[PDB]
Amino acid sequence: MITGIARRLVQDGAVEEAVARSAMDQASAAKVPLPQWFAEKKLVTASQLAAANAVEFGMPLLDVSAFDASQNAVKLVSEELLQKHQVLPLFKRGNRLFVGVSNPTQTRALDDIKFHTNLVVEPILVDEDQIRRTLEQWQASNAALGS
């Protein structure tokens, strides 16, 4: 019976089949959304969880640490939205604003950003930690251009 990210995480070798069964069983008992369970129980790493999230949802995954910060798009989104959702806007091309997310179901942030920005928003997977660290760095860079 192991399916979902529970399945992928053992595909990718991130955690054993036994301890994946636990998480399905206990996250059902707790009525807790399974990937949050994995994340909060610290059974796998933020990047491990994101690699499964990607294969699981047909969504691309990016290492932002290789992203050239000078090209970011953080400034196109209010800081207020940046707080309400843990998301990391990455890059504009034409209409598109690519927005890094740690959870691919997290549709509320994409609609809020579309409305705010009147651009086409496509999501990209970035793992939860890189979103946190890289956002604050990119904000330091942008801040060096002025108030």
Partner: protein, 109 residues
């Protein structure tokens, strides 16, 4: 363990180039699964020449099989900074003169 990417023309080179990567990147379609951070060796052909340019790169992007959109499965490969990589970024940036500012979408962003 040797990827090969050959780009017949400028459009194909545009689809593949990752300008938002530090030092530059190229998308390589492959069914093989790779982890972020893997060092990988690529043999790259650009459209101006039959010369095959070795590129020893780190994986920095993946697209899974059966990805949403018509997105193609593969990996983004960061050029190593330093002379060897900087040469390939440079060749790509001049070949793509006149498309650098295009809106048209790519294999990545």
């Amino acid at each position: 363990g040797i990827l090969s990417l050959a780009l017949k023309d400028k459009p194909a080179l545009y689809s593949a180039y990752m300008p938002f990567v530090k030092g530059g990147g190229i998308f390589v379609p492959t069914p093989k699964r790779y982890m972020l951070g893997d060092e990988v060796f690529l043999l790259l052909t650009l459209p101006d020449s039959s010369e095959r340019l070795p590129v020893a790169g780190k994986v920095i992007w993946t697209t899974p099989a059966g990805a949403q959109g018509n997105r193609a499965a593969g990996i983004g490969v960061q050029f190593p900074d330093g002379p060897e990589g900087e040469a390939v970024r440079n060749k790509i940036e001049t070949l793509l003169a006149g498309l650098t500012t295009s809106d048209k979408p790519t294999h990545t962003m």
